[PDB]
């Protein structure tokens, strides 16, 4: 929502919803290049994290 | 031997639950190469690229694919476009010439012809033939395809093998699945006869009593045979050339992909090295993972011929992939590249302004130094703030937060409610008592009681067709509601 | 709403692209203006009591 | 609006498909100059509703008059914006994650497989294997190992065993034991 002078005020989940989604997306970006598996292996360990 | 060693930690860790210690873990086990295995691999990258073209040159209809595409475009008098880019481009190991266009295929139409008599006369596989065919590998050889529609001619063996390898599937599926044909006397008759239905009833001339009852499929599984023969007529190669190229072709990407993995994860380092340079906006291994996709990109562009070590040119990657996604990602409402390089370029400039004057800048004061107008440099102040909290407690102790104080600006009051309910039933009495058609046409030009607006000509067209005294039997009804009925309805008037 | 659309077209009243959120004295409070103090963004002309 | 009582259970991955309106596919929340949200984001029209009354992103269609209406230049039914607070979206995840609550919550899931907790924890973060099937009688289901046993095992058997990492371990072995084989052996 806006606030008053022009800024903004946003949940926590905002977020934790925005780390998910590009962590996500960067995990189909690495199974298309072929990435070596440690690069891989160290993507969905960090997609479990988020 | 640094893996044995882990071995010695791992069954005896203190149980780390960091992500980065983990990563940095499994980044330590493989060395630094120096000097000499940059050129060692390098090597070994483009011996696995050349074997591509390697096995793209044994494609006949290969040739004709760079051949065709251009045959589409010479026919519009005047092409220059984004196809044109991605053509021949040949290298002196680019706007490109029309007097070099008929130049350099002059010699590529020569050889187009002359190759098709020599496999014309004394069969596919004649000695001083396979040579010129082997020559005909070569005049593709001093050339530089790009890498975009490269891609499309790795689809013609990829594609063009598991299109049999569905069709080897599919026989193994329909009939070898039912009637249990044995796969050792049958990969003998593939390489044995391969070209009429002799193979077929062979198995039938031998007793063998699963065979004699494929009646019931008589008109089925060789039916199968004919796509696999359907193959055989529009490409035009032997089987035992198609095998030739994408068994050869199986090395080169393999001798290519294990290279790229031993100069990638060699170089894990120098990433980890420039990723801490830019940790608070996104993370800590968010950094070091956009770099990794961009030291990727380094090993595809290096060259070992131009003389630099690799980590010269690298870091220009990893610094592009890791300041791209601060850009991209790391902010709630997302604030496209060339305004956010023009906020850093205000907040390098407003600290020279504190160096100098030793107070803030006025955005009057600032304008000058930038070389932008009053009004852009105070709508790049209006984009500063960040999204705050619903969660910030705003309290000093752990009650409150900003989210308690936000109100509702959306739905309505209840007296706001309660006037409308009120003003739909004075309506209804007041149209009650005007002549029944005049309260037709004000309930359906105003759509009262009804879910669409009218025009002139749309009740024109149901009851009559006036058109200015529909407007004055409108204008009447207001002179017949214009001051004893009224004295209600004025009191809507304060609203 | 369709009502609201008659009485603007029986009175012929139109309501303008104005609106009011004026300051008004908070309620239970009766006092004494004693002090008015105005601030002005550089460039925005001044009215008649800055 | 009458109902009689409240079942929980566990959500499968066709029901959370059934409860969404549409596929998350950016992390893009509005436009920072003219504040309207962003096609395939967190907040966006054609996923979860309008953001006015009876109103599309463009302007279109308005009013009521048009109720039941998809607007096919932006894709935004002309409903209430009552809707934001019901609508639900879904992310399809490019690998499976496990849920923290029937993991580390004391166990639910190594109390199913009958594995401590301190070694699944292992397969979760990259560390070590398990065996999801050995075909051959040298190894065992549910079987944990490391990198370096593991390229050993690779090179005496070839296909003959099953051994992978990660959360798509765990649900190969959470699908492959039947359950009421094993309340007829317990």
């Not at chain 4, 371990?169 to 492959?176: E, M, N, Y």
Request: proline share 3%; with cysteine; glycine share 4%.
């Amino acid at each position: 929502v806006p606030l008053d002078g022009g800024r903004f005020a946003t949940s926590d989940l905002n977020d934790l919803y925005r780390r998910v989604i590009n962590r996500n997306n960067r995990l189909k970006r690495l199974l298309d290049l072929a990435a070596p598996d440690i690069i891989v292996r160290n993507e969905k360990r960090m997609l479990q994290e988020a | 031997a640094a893996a044995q060693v882990l071995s010695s930690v791992e069954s005896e860790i203190g149980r780390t639950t960091d992500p980065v210690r983990m990563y940095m873990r499994e980044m330590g086990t493989v060395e630094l190469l120096t000097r000499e295995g940059e050129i060692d691999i390098a090597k070994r990258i483009e011996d696995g690229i050349n074997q591509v073209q390697c096995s793209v040159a044994e494609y006949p209809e290969a040739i004709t694919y760079l051949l065709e595409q251009y045959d589409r475009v010479e026919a519009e008098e005047a092409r220059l476009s984004d196809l044109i880019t991605g053509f021949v481009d040949p290298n002196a190991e680019n706007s490109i010439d029309p007097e070099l266009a008929r130049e350099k295929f002059a010699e590529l139409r020569a050889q187009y012809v002359v190759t098709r008599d020599t496999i014309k006369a004394k069969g596919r596989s004649h000695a001083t033939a396979q040579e010129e065919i082997l020559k005909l590998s070569e005049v593709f050889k001093q050339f530089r395809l790009v890498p975009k529609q490269f891609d499309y001619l790795v689809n013609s063996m990829r594609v063009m093998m598991d299109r049999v390898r569905t069709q080897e599937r599919l026989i193994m599926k329909l009939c070898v699945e039912q009637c249990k044909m044995p796969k050792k006397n049958f990969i003998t008759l593939f390489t044995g006869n391969e070209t009429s239905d002799t193979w077929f009833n062979a198995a039938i001339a031998m007793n063998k009593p699963w065979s004699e009852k494929l009646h019931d499929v008589s008109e089925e599984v060789h039916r199968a045979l004919q796509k696999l023969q359907q193959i055989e007529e529009e490409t035009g190669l032997t089987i035992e050339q198609v095998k030739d190229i994408n068994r050869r072709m199986s090395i080169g990407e393999a001798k290519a992909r294990r290279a790229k993995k031993e100069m990638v994860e060699a170089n894990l380092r120098l990433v980890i090295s420039i990723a801490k340079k830019y940790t608070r906006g996104l993370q800590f291994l968010d950094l070091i993972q956009e770099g990794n996709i961009g030291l990727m990109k380094a090993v595809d562009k290096f060259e070992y011929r131009r003389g630099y070590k690799f980590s010269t040119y690298a870091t220009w990657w990893i610094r592009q992939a890791i300041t791209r996604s601060i850009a991209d990602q790391a902010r709630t409402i997302r604030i496209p590249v060339h305004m956010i390089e023009t906020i850093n370029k205000l907040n390098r400039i407003s600290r020279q302004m504190l160096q100098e004057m030793g107070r803030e800048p006025t955005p009057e004061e600032l304008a000058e130094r930038m070389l932008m107008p009053e009004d852009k440099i105070r709508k790049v102040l209006k984009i500063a703030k960040e999204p705050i909290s619903m969660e910030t407690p705003i309290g000093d102790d752990e009650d409150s937060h900003l989210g308690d104080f936000i109100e509702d600006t959306t739905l309505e009051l209840p007296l706001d409610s309660a006037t409308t309910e009120s003003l739909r039933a004075a309506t209804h009495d007041v149209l009650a008592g005007l002549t029944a058609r005049e309260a037709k046409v004000l309930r359906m030009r105003f759509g009262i009681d009804m879910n669409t607006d009218y025009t002139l000509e749309e009740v024109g067209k149901q009851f009559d067709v006036t058109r200015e005294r529909i407007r004055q039997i409108e204008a009447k009804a207001l002179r017949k509601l214009r001051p004893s009925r009224s004295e209600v309805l004025r009191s809507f008037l304060d609203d | 709403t369709p009502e609201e659309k008659l009485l603007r077209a029986i009175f012929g009243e139109k309501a303008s692209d104005v609106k009011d959120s004026s300051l008004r004295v908070p309620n239970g409070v009766s006092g004494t203006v004693i002090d008015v103090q105005v601030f002005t963004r550089d460039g925005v002309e001044k009215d008649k009591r800055a | 609006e009458e109902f009689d009582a409240i079942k929980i259970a566990l959500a499968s991955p066709d029901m959370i498909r059934s409860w969404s309106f549409g596929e998350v596919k950016k992390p893009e929340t509005i436009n920072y100059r003219t504040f309207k949200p962003e096609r395939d984001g967190l907040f966006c029209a054609r996923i979860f509703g309008p953001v006015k009354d009876y109103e599309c992103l463009c302007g279109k269609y308005k009013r009521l008059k048009h109720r039941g209406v998809i607007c096919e230049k932006c894709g935004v039914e002309v409903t209430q914006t009552k809707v934001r607070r019901e609508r639900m979206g879904h992310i399809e995840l490019a690998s499976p994650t496990a849920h923290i609550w029937f993991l580390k919550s004391l166990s639910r899931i190594g109390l199913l497989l009958d594995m401590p907790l301190r070694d699944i924890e292992r397969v979760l973060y990259f560390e070590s294997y398990v065996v999801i099937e050995g075909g051959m009688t040298n190894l065992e289901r549910q079987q944990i190992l490391t990198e370096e046993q593991y390229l050993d095992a690779l090179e005496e058997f070839g296909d003959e065993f099953d051994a992978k990492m990660g959360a798509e371990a765990i649900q190969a072995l959470l699908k492959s034991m039947d359950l009421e084989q094993e309340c007829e052996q317990l």
